[PDB]
């Protein structure tokens, strides 16, 4: 009986080796034909259209984050206060407000004790407001003083949250003046491009991403290298320069990405990064924007990172969720999916 069982096992093993060889050869030939058929750009467009159709067949998703609940609520109050205040302000007034707020943020960062005292949550904010007025009632303008008194009056989980909130308000003012001008799309594109170029040059970001050196020096380096160029948008330039100036142990590339996210979010949209093998057509871009907005409810802006290794389809990452329609993923699944 043992001999018979061994013979049967040998037979099954031979069948298994033959099946594995056949499947391996078939899947390799499938990979070859796929890579050959995707060469035609029309094939790429057809695959992209099919994936888009799959998206329209998909159900919508059920759905600053690092801030705690208390600090998040405080920052929400601060931003709505700024939104109410900024209605009457103008372009030059908004620029002055942003500059003053950045100056105050660097003052707090440099002077740790004052920020510490100013950050402790307290039921009554009157002492904090008095402290602000005695400190910088005349140094800054009325709007800046009002925003700062609002910021202190609220509750911050940690002291650094106050500096974060002031910097957020400065960026808010810069984006508001950009919107008033009408270059919102231009500033978004420029910020995304700056993020891309910083990502391409990690060493430049690392050099810029240190606060061990004077802020003015690194701002000048940024101006000479990237920001000081003929086509760079003025508002994007100032925003990035102030952000690098106020850096506190963060990489310049990550800060730029966060800035772009905030700029797009001000309009109420969400950034989605879409990787494709070939550049999308304008009809394709519009269809993708529409279907992604439908899936996530609120509208989304689309960033393209062409990568030939996708071999068609799209890989859409947004809000920590990835939809991977790339043909390369299908090929990998087929390779690993064999019996």
């Amino acid at each position: 009986a043992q001999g018979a069982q061994q013979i049967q096992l040998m037979r099954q093993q031979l069948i298994r080796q033959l099946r594995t060889g056949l499947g391996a050869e078939a899947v390799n030939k499938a990979a070859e034909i796929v890579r050959a058929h995707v060469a035609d750009p029309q094939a790429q467009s057809a695959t992209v259209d099919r994936f888009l159709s799959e998206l329209e067949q998909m159900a919508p998703s059920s759905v600053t984050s690092r801030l705690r609940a208390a600090s998040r609520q405080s920052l929400a109050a601060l931003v709505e206060k700024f939104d109410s205040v900024a209605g009457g302000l103008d372009a030059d007034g908004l620029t002055n407000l942003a500059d003053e707020l950045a100056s105050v943020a660097k003052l707090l960062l440099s002077e740790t004790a004052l920020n510490k005292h100013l950050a402790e949550p307290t039921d009554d904010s009157a002492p904090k407001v008095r402290l602000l007025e005695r400190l910088l009632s005349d140094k800054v303008s009325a709007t800046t003083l009002d925003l700062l008194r609002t910021a202190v009056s609220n509750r911050w989980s940690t002291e650094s949250n106050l500096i974060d909130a002031v910097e957020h308000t400065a960026r808010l003012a810069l984006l508001k003046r950009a919107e008033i001008a009408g270059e919102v799309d231009e500033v978004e594109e420029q910020l995304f491009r700056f993020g891309r170029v910083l990502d391409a040059e990690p060493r430049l970001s690392a050099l810029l991403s240190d606060y061990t050196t004077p802020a003015e020096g690194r701002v000048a380096l940024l101006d000479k290298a990237l920001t000081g160029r003929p086509g760079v948008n003025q508002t994007a330039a100032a925003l990035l320069s102030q952000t690098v100036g106020l850096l506190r142990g963060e990489r310049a590339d990550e800060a730029v990405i966060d800035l772009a996210e905030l700029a797009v979010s001000r309009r109420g949209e969400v950034v989605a990064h879409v990787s494709a093998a070939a550049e999308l057509s304008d009809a394709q871009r519009t269809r993708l924007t529409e279907v992604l907005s439908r899936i996530y409810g609120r509208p989304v802006s689309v960033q393209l990172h062409v990568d030939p290794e996708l071999l068609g389809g799209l890989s859409i990452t947004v809000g920590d969720e990835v939809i991977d329609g790339s043909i390369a993923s299908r090929l990998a699944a087929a390779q690993t999916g064999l019996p």
Binding site: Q2, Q13, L18, A26, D324, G337
Partner: protein, 394 residues
Amino acid sequence: ISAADIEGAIEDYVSSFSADTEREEIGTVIDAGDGIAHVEGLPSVMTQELLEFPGGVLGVALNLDEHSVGAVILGEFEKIEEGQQVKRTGEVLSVPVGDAFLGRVVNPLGQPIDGQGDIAAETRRALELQAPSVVQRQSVSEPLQTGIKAIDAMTPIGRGQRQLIIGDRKTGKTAVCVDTILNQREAWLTGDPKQQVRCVYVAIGQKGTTIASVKRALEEGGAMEYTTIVAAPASDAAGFKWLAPYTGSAIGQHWMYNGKHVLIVFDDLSKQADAYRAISLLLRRPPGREAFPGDVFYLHSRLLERCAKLSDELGGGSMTGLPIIETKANDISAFIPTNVISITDGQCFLESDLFNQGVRPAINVGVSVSRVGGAAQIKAMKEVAGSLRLDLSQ
């Protein structure tokens, strides 16, 4: 050998191929090393969820904090790198289970390692389904004959009982367990599932050639027909060594809950405890006695409590446990031996001194006991061996 079958199968697979897209929640590796990784993201990951790393590597989410997820890599962690993308699987750690696992050698994830192709899994079972309650069991009443007089007469083992085989190295522990597995050959040949016993041999931290020797011994005696080996050799990551007993327990539980009688051998839980301690230390959890984590007793208590005797309302299935524990210099007072002795339903304690005297199996009669007693014996054995153990102690 029918080629048409080969084609048919390949065509069936290709037609069944549907790599349809779906929405997935991702995270990013931020640091990794020594079989541990930390993952930012995964906002909806659930405790002890299986995570997919690039290259087919699997991990398990153990620590969940506001910042990251501390995960244990289950094999082949040298490819894990910072910045890699980690996928959710949306399901707690679980293994395939089915009758096809009989005669196979699998790793703690149920993947075959005997090089005999895939295993047709009846279904999947989560590894942390709780043990039967007080009301879901019935008293141990059926003997599980080991074929060894010293055990069957003095420390009888019933179906649904946990009997600890504890002793120094080379005292005959594996011999006792393998003999017990082999003794079920007649019960299997009967063909009656009320009599058949399906055996699961879990090898934790054992040398590969040692596991091969055990498998060969089982083959020669015909046991390999009704036996499954869950192998976590010494070369494996601490994740597999920690996880193997639970994999074997899940495989056995699938049969137990369907009216079958199962016998599971854990060879041995000392190495599982060491692997769990290594994982906990690498996760930087606060250690306890002998650097073991605080919940090292819980590790074995929840494992060995799944070996039960189900009531008739649940099919009357059973799973008998034969955990093995290695003592050092005959110190049953060490932390892990004392933990396990307080869990199982008795122990067979083996001595180097008795072994060298020619007393083989080297059961220390005075200290070895069965907590089921006469209920785990047939009437004749009870009548003849009524007070044999007490007489030998005297």
